[PDB]
């Protein structure tokens, strides 16, 4: 008897993901991740988005 | 006698111009202004960067 995910996992666009996709026809997963990530002087994100 | 202002102004770039500035070679200054009010629904901002 296995253990299975039940549904889908959902992907939704955060608001920063809004303008870049506006303005540069681009989507950078999880902004605020590395944003964060990067202002703060880490070097590894936890997980994949 | 006039009034001029003693000091020059500061631009900084927000961290989210950080991010944008490394990944798509390009900055929207007051990026989050933008997004608030895209998200908002708001067609106006009071003033510019």
């Not at 902004?31 to 002087?41: E, I, M, Q």
């Amino acid at each position: 008897t296995v253990s299975a995910p039940a549904t889908y996992g959902n992907f939704v666009l955060s608001p920063e993901n809004a303008v870049t996709a506006i303005s540069y026809h681009s989507i950078l997963a999880d902004f605020n991740s590395y944003k964060a990530h990067l202002t703060s002087g880490q070097p590894h994100l936890p997980n994949d988005s």
